[PDB]
Amino acid sequence: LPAKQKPECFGVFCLTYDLKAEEETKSWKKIINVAVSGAAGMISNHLLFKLASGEVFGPDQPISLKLLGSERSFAALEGVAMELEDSLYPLLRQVSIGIDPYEIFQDAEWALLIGAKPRGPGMERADLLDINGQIFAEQGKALNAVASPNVKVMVVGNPCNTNALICLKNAPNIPPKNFHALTRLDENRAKCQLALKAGVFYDKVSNVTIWGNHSTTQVPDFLNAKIHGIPVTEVIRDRKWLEDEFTNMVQTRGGVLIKKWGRSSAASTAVSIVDAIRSLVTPTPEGDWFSTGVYTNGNPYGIAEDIVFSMPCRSKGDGDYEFVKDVIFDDYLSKKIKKSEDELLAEKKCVAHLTGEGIAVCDLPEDTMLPGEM
Amino acid sequence: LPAKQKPECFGVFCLTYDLKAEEETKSWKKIINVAVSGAAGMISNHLLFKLASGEVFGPDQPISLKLLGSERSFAALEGVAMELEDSLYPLLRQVSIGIDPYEIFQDAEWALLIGAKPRGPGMERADLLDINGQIFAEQGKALNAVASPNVKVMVVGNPCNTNALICLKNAPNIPPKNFHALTRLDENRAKCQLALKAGVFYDKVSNVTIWGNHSTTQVPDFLNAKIHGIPVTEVIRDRKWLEDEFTNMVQTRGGVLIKKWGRSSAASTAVSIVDAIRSLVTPTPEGDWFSTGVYTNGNPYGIAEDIVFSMPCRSKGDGDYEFVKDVIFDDYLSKKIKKSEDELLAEKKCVAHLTGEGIAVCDLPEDTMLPGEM
Ligand SMILES: NC(=O)c1ccc[n+]([C@@H]2O[C@H](COP(=O)([O-])OP(=O)(O)OC[C@H]3O[C@@H](n4cnc5c(N)ncnc54)[C@H](OP(=O)(O)O)[C@@H]3O)[C@@H](O)[C@H]2O)c1
Ligand SMILES: NC(=O)c1ccc[n+]([C@@H]2O[C@H](COP(=O)([O-])OP(=O)(O)OC[C@H]3O[C@@H](n4cnc5c(N)ncnc54)[C@H](OP(=O)(O)O)[C@@H]3O)[C@@H](O)[C@H]2O)c1
């Protein structure tokens, strides 16, 4: 539980200048502090450079990276940091690597929590929740204790939704609206599938939203989606497909992707992550929206409270967001969303011992983790 | 030796629109055709998305990717292309994957030839040159036969320098000035090292040039380099270091990098590659320069002709370049450059059977391949 223990910089990033705003590069904004857990993993190995290049926050936004890793993968983190220095990225004003959350999360304005333990060979969902839940329970206290009171936290380590509930549950000082579960890779994969069916390039499909858990209970919402400007429903008139098939296509994208030999969707996920961050740092296009697993309290859809449930949101580009109100539902959608909700509330109970609710009671389906995920 | 055999597109990229310049996105330039060999490898897995994101050619430059792979790694290429489609990159107007150079290199304006066979466990340099030389001999004929008469070719597969000589030697219709050997990762690594020693951030070091082969005979030129605006020589006054140590630090960067467990400098190399391309597509900053293994004919330094020797160049950002004339040399520099030249001319002879010169005569040192390279 550190205090006074500040994070040490990394070679060259220690030799950095004053602060962009007054001598050279006065065009640059004030530096943004970004923390990344799972910093030595594959998604990170992609994400990091996209951040450093200004692809994420812009070309006039000097960045500071605080890479949180783990004992075992420390050599790896040193390596990534070594690649970071040989990249000569001007925006990357400073980087620091370490294994202590209370040190690394120190002053973080964005906490991109990718990284959690992989599903064991014969591991039951409940324990998958327990193990990673603990990691996130801890990172939550750290964030709470030593991070910017308005840290925008973005969770990608599975089970992301619950992992996020836990994180905010252990980080009371931090606004729960700030915690996001990454369902965006799912959104992108779904646009691609709706473009593929309709015979249009993915840049013509929009208003795609994902509801529920980042698991096989999520719902690639085709009812409110649009292609070219008109509801998907009246472009892909094959209604049976949309209901009986669409979902399973997005739901297995990663699974087929992995068949093209063993690599995870690192590059794509790395991309989803930046698109995710941008949807909060950039004003949502007129009439469109993005998907994010966020806290349910305040939602107008009727979804249960006290959980992290992905839903349509729009932003003015300030880090915050608001739920999208102009949306419709039917028997299909309504029942599918409610079915994911059931799952989530069960994980919640199964994770009562890491959320501060009480004794855990697990009754979960060991078949829901998305194909292709580590 | 295809003709009439055109490259088929890939799912979603087949459903693409007209051509940016007249309906929507009239701000966009005319599409650029980019071919990538070794498309399913690690450096590519990084490079590709940087290209697609517009990081390389700009945000108003729609791109077309022609990914050349190999039979064995075809499943992998399908996978990368699958990640490409789930990324929803607007600039990535079209992509096509395949294993035939005469098909894939069809109409290429940029041929980023990363990818060649790795050094065998007990493989002698000569054969390393032979094996990869053949690949490049073939890709050269293809490029020559079916590519844009002004293809800018950028070789990264080792032995890059010779591999490039061979490529242009088998591609007579294509201007030899167009072939580039990637010595940029080396340049970047060296700036980082000169920044580290002088106690300044890498953004204060400039005019670093690399001469010779992309091997342990190259010369991280500290004599013409500058820090803050004044020659490195009068900032890092520890002259013995610059001569006796500097070189070995850059020369082993990859070697130490790999010690931080088994991953190649994929992310960094991916970065060097884009910096390389930009130095040709962007006007070189006033007084600075970049390093590139290019054809020697016309050089004013005294370096031997008919080889690919990295040297200082500047560009107006049109794809072409010119050698930098305002540069000095001393006993140290002069002798070191000449020693790399010796190597190169020996590889040249060792590769006479792939260059159209005659019977090969190999007499090479089996210790020169840079630490950390596959
Ligand atoms: N939401 C999505 O769509 C999505 C997509 C892909 C993956 N995921 C999920 O995210 C998790 C892993 O992501 P991945 O596939 O990218 O794996 P990965 O790149 O291989 O990274 C896994 C990480 O676990 C890390 N680790 C263990 N304990 C940690 C802790 N105390 N703090 C920080 N890092 C810790 C390791 O740390 P080091 O960094 O030190 O190695 C390692 O990097 C999985 O549960 C996976 O299912 C979600
Ligand atoms: N200049 C530099 O500083 C630098 C830096 C790093 C590496 N390199 C050199 O580049 C070469 C490999 O790069 P790497 O480390 O990035 O390896 P990598 O990512 O693992 O890729 C190696 C590739 O060899 C490919 N291949 C074999 N025959 C091919 C052909 N007919 N056409 C197209 N691709 C072919 C494979 O094809 P698939 O794409 O189908 O798998 C594979 O991707 C090595 O010789 C290495 O030393 C140079």
The Cα–Cα gap between B133 and B353 comes to 9
Calculate how far, in angstroms, residue B266's C-alpha sits from the geometric centre of ligand 2.
Answer: 11
The Cα–Cα gap between B37 and B67 comes to 6
CA-based radius of gyration for chain B = 20
Window A:175-214, CB contacts with B under 8 Å: 185, 188-189, 191-192, 195-196, 199-203
Give the single-character DSSP code of B364.
Answer: -
Window B:138-177, CB contacts with A under 8 Å: none
Q: For A59, which residue in chain B has the nearest alpha carbon? A: B55
Contacts of B244 by beta carbon, 8 Å cutoff, 6+ apart: none
Hey, where are the domains in chain B? Answer: 29-181, 182-356
Give phi and psi for B322, each to the nearest 5: -145, 145
Q: Is B46 a catalytic residue?
A: no
- Please give the interface size between A and B, counted as residue pairs whose CB atoms are below 8 Å apart: 138
- Token pair for A40: 């030595």
Other C-beta atoms within 10 Å of A294: how many? 26
Give phi and psi for B266, each to the nearest 5: -55, -55
The Cα–Cα gap between B153 and B34 comes to 10
Closest-lying ligand to the alpha carbon of A76?
A: 1
Positive or negative: CA dihedral B296, B297, B300, B303: positive
Among protein residues, the one with the nearest Cα to ligand 1's atom 22 is A115
The Cα–Cα gap between A187 and B10 comes to 20
Other C-beta atoms within 10 Å of A238: how many? 12
DSSP line for A281-332: HSBPPTT--EEEEEE-TT-SS---SSSEEEEEEE-BSSS--EE-------HH
Beta bridge partners of B81: none
The Cα–Cα gap between A150 and A152 comes to 6
Contacts of A93 by beta carbon, 8 Å cutoff, 6+ apart: A13, A16, A17, A20, A31, A62, A63, A64
Residues shown for chain A: 374
The Cα–Cα gap between A258 and A371 comes to 8
CA torsion, points B80, B90, A46, B250, in degrees to nearest 10?
100
DSSP line for B40-77: TSHHHHHHHHHHHTTTTT-TT--EEEEEE--GGGHHHH
Residue A189 burial (CB < 10 Å; 0-12/13-18/19+)? buried
Beta bridge partners of B279: none
The Cα–Cα gap between B48 and B43 comes to 8
Tell me which method was used to determine the 3D structure.
X-ray
DSSP line for B135-172: HHHHHHHHHHHHS-TTPEEEE-SSSHHHHHHHHHHT-T
Cβ contact B271:A49 at 8 Å: yes
Instruction: For residue B131, say whether it is annotated as part of any ligand binding site.
Output: no
Residue closest to A258 by CA, chosen among A153, A347, A115, A374: A374
Q: For A48, which residue in chain B has the nearest alpha carbon? A: B267
Cβ contact B76:B84 at 8 Å: no
DSSP line for A102-134: HHHTTT-SEEEE---PPPPTT--HHHHHHHHHH
The response to whether residue A131 sits with its C-beta less than 6 Å from ligand 1 reads: no
**H-only helix segments in chain B:** 42-52, 74-85, 101-104, 125-146, 160-169, 184-198, 239-240, 247-250, 253-259, 266-281, 331-350
Residue closest to A210 by CA, chosen among A89, A116, A291, A315: A291
- Greatest Cα pair distance, chain A, in angstroms, is 62
Q: In a mutational test of the pocket of ligand 2, which residue from B72, B156, B167, B274 has the highest number of ligand atoms less than 8 Å from its CB?
A: B156
Cβ contact A200:A311 at 8 Å: no
The Cα–Cα gap between B372 and B374 comes to 7
Among the listed residues B46, B180, B214, B228, the single catalytic one is B214
**B241 inside 8 A of chain A by CB:** no
CB contact under 8 A, B188 and A259: no
- The distance from CA B101 to its chain's CA centroid, rounded to whole angstroms, is 18
Percentages helix, strand, coil for chain B (3-state, rounded to 5) are 35, 15, 45
Residue closest to B65 by CA, chosen among B80, B44, B48: B48
Cβ contact A292:A276 at 8 Å: yes
- Token pair for B303: 């370096």
SS3 A28: coil
- On chain B, the residues whose CB falls within 8 A of the CB of A266 are 45
- On chain B, the residues whose CB falls within 8 A of the CB of A11 are 196
Per-residue b or e along A92-105, where b marks 16 or more CB atoms closer than 10 Å to that residue's CB = bbbbbbbbebbbbb
SS3 B121: coil
Cβ contact A46:B44 at 8 Å: no
- Token pair for B36: 């990538």
| Nearest chain B Cα distance for residue A76, angstroms | 5
Give, to the nearest 10 degrees, the angle between helix B184-198 and helix B266-281: 100
Beta bridge partners of B152: B110
* CATH number of the A29-181 domain: 3.40.50.720
Cβ contact B210:B219 at 8 Å: yes
**Both ends of chain A: CA-CA distance in Å?**
30
Residues shown for chain B: 374
* CATH number of the B182-356 domain: 3.90.110.10
The Cα–Cα gap between B273 and B59 comes to 18
**H-only helix segments in B147-265:** 160-169, 184-198, 239-240, 247-250, 253-259
Cβ contact B50:B269 at 8 Å: no
Calculate how far, in angstroms, residue B341's C-alpha sits from the geometric centre of ligand 2.
Answer: 25
Cβ contact B73:A190 at 8 Å: no
- On chain B, the residues whose CB falls within 8 A of the CB of A188 are 86-88
Among protein residues, the one with the nearest Cα to ligand 1's atom 27 is A116
Give phi and psi for A52, each to the nearest 5: -60, -30
Contacts of A4 by beta carbon, 8 Å cutoff, 6+ apart: none
Give phi and psi for A256, each to the nearest 5: -75, -35
